[PDB]
Structure formats: C-alpha cells, structure tokens
C-alpha cells in the first residue's frame, strides 16, 4: 500500500502511448487514458491488517515530492472517484515491492506514455 495527498487529477482523454516492446508491435492506439499528480507525505507500507506499515519518509528522495500515477484499462473505473487536493491510499493485492511509484516496474506490459514514459515518477 501507500498514502499520498493527490493534487492533480489529469485528463481521461485520448492520447498515444507505447506498444509492447520487441515482439509484433501495433499502432499506438488512441487510448482514452490518463494519469494524476500526487504529493507524498509518507511512502509505502506493509499490509498490516488492522494496522498499517510505516509510511516511508520521502526525505531521502528529493525527487518528486509528488508522483505521476497513470491509468489505463480497468483503472478507467476510478476517474470520477478522486477529487484533487485530497489524500488517498492505494492498496495492492500483489507481491511486495517498495520503491514502487518512481519508475516503471516489470509486472505488466512495458508500455509507457507519450510524455510520462519515465518523466518524473511514472
């Protein structure tokens, strides 16, 4: 999981992003996708049932007091939910991986957006 005071809910609009690399490629489909900019106050944690982990301090990481969180696919179903300037937590059914929301991982397609391929904290 992680907590973050998000302050920009970007545009669920049609852009052009990457395409799965190396193998048979296709058109950079004009995907109605989006992202968000969210300030950080405490980083990742541990799924501690009734408790949580410790909110990791961003002090040792001057880069991106905020974070660039992207949305395609099923994430589409959260566009309306958030309202910027408010704090939200992301919980994750999946293997633990701190140092998470700074650069693209490996547990999905290596598809990166037009300008936020690795821009700040993709």
Swiss-Prot record:
Compartments in which it is found: Nucleus; Chromosome, Telomere
Similarity comment text for this entry: Belongs to the CTC1 family.
Quaternary assembly: Component of the CST complex, composed of TEN1/C17orf106, CTC1/C17orf68 and STN1; in the complex interacts directly with STN1. Interacts with ACD and POT1.
Gene: CTC1
Residues of the full protein shown: 730 to 851 of 1217
Protein name as catalogued: CST complex subunit CTC1
Disease: Cerebroretinal microangiopathy with calcifications and cysts 1: An autosomal recessive pleiomorphic disorder characterized primarily by intracranial calcifications, leukodystrophy, and brain cysts, resulting in spasticity, ataxia, dystonia, seizures, and cognitive decline. Patients also have retinal telangiectasia and exudates (Coats disease) as well as extraneurologic manifestations, including osteopenia with poor bone healing and a high risk of gastrointestinal bleeding and portal hypertension caused by vasculature ectasias in the stomach, small intestine, and liver.
Signal peptide: none
Organism: Homo sapiens
Function: Component of the CST complex proposed to act as a specialized replication factor promoting DNA replication under conditions of replication stress or natural replication barriers such as the telomere duplex. The CST complex binds single-stranded DNA with high affinity in a sequence-independent manner, while isolated subunits bind DNA with low affinity by themselves. Initially the CST complex has been proposed to protect telomeres from DNA degradation. However, the CST complex has been shown to be involved in several aspects of telomere replication.
